Symmetry: D2
Subunit: 116 residues, 4 copies
């Protein structure tokens, strides 16, 4: 996987399961073009969003539907969603893991970038 | 002062000074309208973005220009920016502090919401 | 005021109020001597732990009683406490703010160190 | 593994490699008895610290030598180490992943607790 997302839940102490997210690439006219999506597995992971050949340089956005997640748990959340916006592959193809830790009024996101 | 933003630098253990950010409000037609902007002070704070009367119910986005902050320090960070998107004043007027902690490959955001 | 602690609750989006904590200093014989203690205010802050004259060079530990905080809210959290252990004033007197963000299964801590 | 530790580096955007840590169990006299240790792999992971039979109820401390890690990178750190103190297995055996995200002046720790 050139791109993987891992989401944890800081209230339950667990992977965050069935969290939906969409991935966008910024177009030449500065709009966001959606191109992939999925929901996290029982281990809080989403794999298989893109392939090496398709995942060219550019600016990418991952929009994580954290609000639906907290709603499903009966917990009032602050954010509409969690975004991660980044330039990919600036100096060549990299493997990216986006890690997110969710609380109702806070989130953190981190990137693990490895050169395959 | 109903909306304040505080930004810290996790590398230097300091306020993040001179960090630009723009606030937007979602309009009735669903586009992001410019709402306010400013840069953090020497204490990493930005106050005076809005007033109670102007800060009506709605979905607000704060886009924090973290990339320029890192680039000015010589660092090429992962994120293009840090976004915070939230519904405000859904249950009457509240005071919001958005707190952000910055590292080159990670950021966290939290909200303190108080009732005046 | 050379040492201040600020504690936020990531579940409620509020200061963490009435959080007890104890500060220790490592002694010449390597044991932890009691240094100061207190509980956070309604603003999640604890000030007045020490003075510039008393806060000499050394290794200090702040043990924050996060378990009691969660238990009083009905929650059985993961951590017994949050610890912050650091060398202080190694390069002359500094002002330290210890910031902690709490969730039932996670906590984060950061330091803001300023030169007066 | 009943106990795994995963450490990431928020400055380099990578697993935190060759981070040493020690694990202690609290004794009846309230002292900490060390019983396991290791250093993180190239993927920032430490496995094999204990076995199901040995990992009985009690209070456990993981002391992560973050200071040596930052020193090895030529970066000035704030903390002496990062601690994680928790009661294990309170309601039966669980699998524990302790996740830590490191910055020079901040760290976060989270637990993923799964029932095997
Ligand atoms: C626990 C784990 C399993 C995991 O499995 C997938 C794999 O091994 O590739 C991957 C990662 C990066 C992790 C670590 C992790 C997950 C979410 C996350 O936000 C972080 C960073 C973090 C850690 C502690 C507190 C706040 C943030 C690490
Ligand atoms: C909101 C605030 C009020 C505050 O009042 C006291 C003062 O102004 O000195 C001080 C600080 C450092 C803060 C910011 C703050 C509080 C806790 C805390 O963990 C952090 C770092 C952080 C920020 C976002 C997500 C995780 C961690 C900052």
């Amino acid at each position: 996987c050139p791109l993987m997302v891992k989401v944890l839940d800081a209230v339950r102490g667990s992977p965050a399961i069935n969290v939906a997210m969409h991935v966008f690439r910024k177009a030449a006219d500065d709009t966001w073009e959606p191109f992939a999506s999925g929901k996290t597995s029982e281990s809080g992971e989403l794999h298989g969003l893109t392939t090496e050949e398709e995942f060219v340089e550019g600016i990418y956005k991952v929009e994580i539907d954290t609000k639906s997640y907290w709603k499903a748990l009966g917990i009032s959340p602050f954010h509409e969603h969690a975004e991660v916006v980044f330039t990919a592959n600036d100096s060549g193809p990299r493997r990216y893991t986006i890690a997110a830790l969710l609380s109702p009024y806070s989130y953190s996101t981190t990137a693990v970038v490895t050169n395959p």
